[PDB]
Design an enzyme around this catalytic site. Sequence first.
Site, PDB file in Angstrom:
ATOM      1  N   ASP A 152       0.759  -1.269  -5.254  1.00 33.84           N
ATOM      2  CA  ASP A 152       1.396  -1.936  -4.122  1.00 33.84           C
ATOM      3  C   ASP A 152       2.246  -3.077  -4.676  1.00 33.84           C
ATOM      4  OD1 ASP A 152       2.131  -3.230  -1.800  1.00 33.84           O
ATOM      5  OD2 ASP A 152       0.081  -3.461  -1.030  1.00 33.84           O
ATOM      6  N   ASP A 179      -2.241   3.813   5.471  1.00 34.05           N
ATOM      7  CA  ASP A 179      -1.495   2.877   4.645  1.00 34.05           C
ATOM      8  C   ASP A 179      -2.440   2.205   3.656  1.00 34.05           C
ATOM      9  OD1 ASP A 179       0.845   1.454   3.815  1.00 34.05           O
ATOM     10  OD2 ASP A 179       0.205  -0.270   5.007  1.00 34.05           O
ATOM     11  N   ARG A 226       1.011   6.509   2.424  1.00 32.15           N
ATOM     12  CA  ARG A 226       1.842   5.759   1.484  1.00 32.15           C
ATOM     13  C   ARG A 226       1.594   6.185   0.043  1.00 32.15           C
ATOM     14  NH1 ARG A 226       2.069  -0.826   1.403  1.00 32.15           N
ATOM     15  NH2 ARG A 226       0.354  -0.535  -0.093  1.00 32.15           N
ATOM     16  N   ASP A 240       7.774  -0.342   1.347  1.00 31.93           N
ATOM     17  CA  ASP A 240       8.430  -1.534   1.883  1.00 31.93           C
ATOM     18  C   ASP A 240       9.774  -1.732   1.198  1.00 31.93           C
ATOM     19  OD1 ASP A 240       6.247  -1.863   3.507  1.00 31.93           O
ATOM     20  OD2 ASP A 240       5.267  -3.317   2.181  1.00 31.93           O
TER      21      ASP A 240
END
EC number: 3.2.1.207
Lengths: 83, 850
Positions: free
Chosen positions: B208, B448, B508, B524
């Site tokens: 992430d 997510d 994700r 993102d």
Amino acid sequence: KPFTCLDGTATIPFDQVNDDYCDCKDGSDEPGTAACPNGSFHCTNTGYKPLYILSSRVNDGVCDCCDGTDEYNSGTVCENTCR
Amino acid sequence: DRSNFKTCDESSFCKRQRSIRPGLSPYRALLDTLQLGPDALTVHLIHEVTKVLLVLELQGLQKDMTRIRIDELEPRRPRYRVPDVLVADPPTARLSVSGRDDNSVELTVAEGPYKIILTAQPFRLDLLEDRSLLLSVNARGLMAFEHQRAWEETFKTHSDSKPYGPTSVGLDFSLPGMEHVYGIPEHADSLRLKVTEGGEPYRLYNLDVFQYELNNPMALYGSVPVLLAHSFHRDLGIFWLNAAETWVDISSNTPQTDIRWMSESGIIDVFLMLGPSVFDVFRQYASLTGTQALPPLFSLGYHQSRWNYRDEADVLEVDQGFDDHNMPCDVIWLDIEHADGKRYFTWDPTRFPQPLNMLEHLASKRRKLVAIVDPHIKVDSGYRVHEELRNHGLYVKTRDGSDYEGWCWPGSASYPDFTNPRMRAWWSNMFSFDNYEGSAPNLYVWNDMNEPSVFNGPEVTMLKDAVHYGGWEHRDIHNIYGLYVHMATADGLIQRSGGIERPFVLSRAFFSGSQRFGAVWTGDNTAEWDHLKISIPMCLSLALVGLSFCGADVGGFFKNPEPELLVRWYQMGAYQPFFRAHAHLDTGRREPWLLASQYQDAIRDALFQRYSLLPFWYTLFYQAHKEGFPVMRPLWVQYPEDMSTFSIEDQFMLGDALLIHPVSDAGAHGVQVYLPGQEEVWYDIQSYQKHHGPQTLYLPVTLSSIPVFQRGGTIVPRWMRVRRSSDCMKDDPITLFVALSPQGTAQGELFLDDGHTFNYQTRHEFLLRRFSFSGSTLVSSSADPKGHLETPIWIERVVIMGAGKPAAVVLQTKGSPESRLSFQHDPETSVLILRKPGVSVASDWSIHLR
Ligand SMILES: O=[N+]([O-])c1cc(-c2ncccn2)ccc1NCCCCCCN[C@H]1C[C@](O)(CO)[C@@H](O)[C@H](O)[C@H]1O
Ligand SMILES: [Ca+2]
Ligand SMILES: [Ca+2]
């Protein structure tokens, strides 16, 4: 007698009015179906105010008129809610 | 600001492996230990210096593939082998010794033409078709296999106890004739992978990365260890089946490309997919890991999302806003603020007190809702999910045996062990309508943060020495943690329906095999023009490796897009597989009707084009589901011999029929569109103007422009009656767009079913039609007789580009008298419109132009 589009663009036989194919550029030949992209469907709506909706919302399965007459062949049965 | 994440030099096993430079390999094959088994060839390898003994398992496979597996001969502890990713045990082909000498054994796969030459000293493998060398293994002596010995590493403030010591594995591959390689997502980098010689290797480790940047090889949220190589002459693929942290080096050297894989643990397990064409590679990989799950039709429409919609009233206002502004939309999304303080499977008692009534209102509009469910579970004795998982011992654990606790959205949280099948069954059952209170059949799910994201963890993820089901370390399984979440969620949506409804799950994090479970998106991104541009190469690299259901946040997640950028992003998103607008918590509201009318109109136009192409999209995804062919494709997949397409990433194709070059520059006056193909024609679908290839056409654009061309020789099905959602449209008649080849021919397909169940498979309730044009006749026939469907869909119109004016048009239908059709013709554009054929889409018919 043949039918003439309200804008004045073509003249079509009377059996091409509401035949579920768009023949007039203004949509005037399909007031009761979903065939034209720029057409309109009239809700009489007895017991409330009358309403115009997009042709694309005729028989889409969604109740748009309070009288439910926009859904006449879609599998959705709309109850009258004008009162 | 990237000190958070390790470079290869800061990764101790990458530092060790990468310090091994191309040279004479110390590994050697003991041909005395050779054995031809019923499924494989086994032979012992030995490290000449350390005398460590390894076992090579070599297999020729059906569909022209080779599998190479290397493990220790007698290990102290078992090494990890990736489960649940292969859909089947790959059918083997028989190997034969067809040649031998003092330092070599030549092997033949079945009866040819594929041969594998095993060199004993130094160890090496060459793969040949007849006498043409296809690729080499360990040609540069970079094989490395740290055996389990009888260490402790700290990065930043996090300590990896690493109780098993160095266990990394690595191996190199040489690709003679190959100058272009692709794949190994996910990276915010170009479609054509760059050489790593002067910089970092490409990293595969689900991570992430806050506000990730472009044109760099940092690991992002997903990892698919698949690399495709393309040349004028052939296509090949390498599938490195390893679930641990993996670095990938790429170097070019008569033109040749070398690939080196470096993984932290597990065995060496690699599939070689020999083509020869790229579609053969698609088929080969699909037979190993499966195909794209067929999405329910609604999920191919437009999704409206943001962090966050306020409450039930906001959601209904958004729903009404689409209808009041004549814009279609299928799904409205509920991000994490819809739950009770980020306790998933709950609803905020003030802002979402009656979810069933909200879902019923959406169902009356024939729309769906998506709710987010993350894998981290808030540590809270009042939270039943946490109490059940803790009491049943279904959490990931630390070495001392206590449940792992990290920090995420709800504060302190624990992480279920999704590698445990008992945990996945629990998770799947949790989606029953009795367990997930407030859910309904039109509620779907978004997974997510399933890398898993751990805010206070090393590199924002779980510790390497956390312990999973069976005693395996987290470092062994990391890259399939997300896939297991995606899988268990999708199975939950199937089970809750009694096995009837197809699921929709967005995930994700992902891995090889994730295409079986739904969609993915690139995380993102940022409201910037370069992030708009990079969505094409990112989703193209995913398509090439089987994940056809890909997209990027329309408008950008971070920051506020200028209106012109948002328009261009809607146009771009409208021609990408997963089409969702999404936005960060602190951005301004940007529902498409909040813009000035000129921008609204361009966006509505883009939305209408997408909805009218749903029959086309649906058929491409059915072909992806059945054949393993990507929906969104690079130009070189369709033109393998045109070397000028090998790097193109500002254009793409949908199937073989549509070429797309979206405007991706502020204030642009035109675009340069490369139209490829010798003897090929392309039709501007906006103007119907025909263009011959190959050429780079300068096309002037306005705000409402979307440069789209239909290839000559194709037939594209459309729903010209755009309604408020796809459910409203799925009984409507079809318009066929015939783009005539220079030879006056065209072909196309169309898939239809009920739009949301598995009946197409369990009951063969579907239609697959073939439309063919040749001579002066358009013919509809069945492309699959086993499929029948009760449907009112009919052919309301046929649009033929590049046709002359006929004297008469005649329709013949099985069961009907021959009839005449009226028609309209434009001499300027050479476009012929056949009026209302009126034939059922389930019927064989033919239309003749006299
Ligand atoms: O580094 N920080 O700023 C930082 C540091 C810490 C921290 N805390 C303790 C100890 C150490 N560090 C905590 C939080 C942050 N900021 C995080 C905000 C970035 C937004 C990205 C999230 N996007 C996700 C989630 C979602 O936003 C909503 O579910 C979806 O909308 C998206 O689609 C999806 O991708
Ligand atoms: Ca008509
Ligand atoms: Ca209606």
